[model samples]
Target chain A: MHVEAMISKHPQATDRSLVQCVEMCFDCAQTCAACADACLGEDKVADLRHCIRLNLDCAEICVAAGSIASRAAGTEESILRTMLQTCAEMCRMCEEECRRHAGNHEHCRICADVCKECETACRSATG
Target chain B: MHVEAMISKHPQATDRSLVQCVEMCFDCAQTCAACADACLGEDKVADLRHCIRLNLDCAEICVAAGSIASRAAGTEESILRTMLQTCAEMCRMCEEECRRHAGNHEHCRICADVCKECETACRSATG
Candidate 1:
């Protein structure tokens, strides 16, 4: 979204890995939130209980991590690294949970794919 | 905060436990985010890198969980239980991390207390 453009305005936004990770964090957050909502609308929502929970958790972590990463000033390398690591873990956890219902729910399928992408971006940023 | 008033307007806002949990979630999120910013301003900011990371993570989870809990419509009990559990875990981790620096940083001290409150609220909500 506008994340890239927003980061471009910051002086310490030169790191491509950071930029990529931040963008993915926001993207995955939105996707996970929407997926949770979608799950609520499913015919068998009770079946997707775990999926919905993970979605909410993943969405929150992604948004927080994205917000912190966006602020280029007073950047802490180790903190950023840890944030990325946690983001990746959450993404992976959510992805696996969503994948279980991917065949029956389009939203779950899409969320899983987005989580995978975010996990990849977060891992790359940590490196 | 105004969260109580907001919930009062909702049709399914009869549960006091949910209201308390939501309020705590928002309160803890704000404190964690502010603490992270405060950590960045400390003379030995580098020393608080891990604390800052946990703050960012905890803040994100609190916000996400709060937002989801606010939506009284389409309420899924199981999902809510899981979210509260995760939120409590994050709050505990962040609180422990922030307490380490509480002696020197007022913000961290405040955040640690808020996190403890949130953890209790989350646990109570889950029950």
Candidate 2:
């Protein structure tokens, strides 16, 4: 993905935390979305309703935070920080939920990995 | 925005419509997020609960669609197409609702404009 390249074009892209945050945000967003779709395809989709919902919520926040961090101008640092914090929290929650099904579902396992990555990235951004 | 530059790195980035879709999706996602926050700050936030919900839903879908479109490898074209369609539909509904409060809220007015742009971009991607 051009996420790395695009962020590199920004003046502040040199900040490792910012670059890591953007990359993980996009990665986590995609993984959560795919995981949610997979959950819908499972036989026990009804049982996974909450996990699906959390995936969607985490994916949305990650994307929003990623986009905000990508911008070079009009960077709302405080808002971006808040978004990162929220995204991290959501990622943690989603990861916890997904981990419950990790042994039974490959998608959940993968989603949990990315969610952890995103959570760490977001925490780094906070610092 | 580096959106164009980032898309340019992909072989299929030549598709003007896809590039347009990504840009508009990101733009709309941010606007919807900001609009939701603005709605929460309003005096009659309880009355705008529905609007806030729609804004959050639209924002999430737009961001998901954008990230899916950004991927260069193993793209599930059909799924992406479906996502774009859903995102467009959500944007339309959200835009219509936001328009109802455009006169009273500046955020809603700007959100409606971005939603329209995103809807058009998504439609173009469908083609």
Best DockQ among the predictions, by candidate number: 1
Locate the minimum summed-lDDT window of 10 residues in model 1 chain A. Answer: A71-80
Clashing pairs in 2: none
- Write the residue-wise lDDT of candidate 2 on B9-105 in tens digits: 3223267898788777766776676577667767777878988899889878987788777664345535878889999999999999999988887
For candidate 1, the TM-score is: 0.59
Expressed as tens digits, the lDDT of each residue in B25-111 for candidate 1 is: 998999998999999998999899778878887887788779867754243322456556778877988899899889998899999
* Candidate chain B TM-scores, in order: 0.90, 0.91
- List candidate 2 segments past 4 Å from native: A1-127, B11-13, B73-77
* Each candidate's clash count: 0, 0
- Model 1 alpha-carbon miss at residue A19, Å: 13
lDDT of 2 at A6: 34
Error in Å for residue B103 of model 2: 0.7
Cα-based TM-score, every candidate: 0.59, 0.54
All models, DockQ values?
A: 0.18, 0.05
- Looking at candidate 2 chain B, the ten consecutive residues that score lowest on lDDT are B4-13
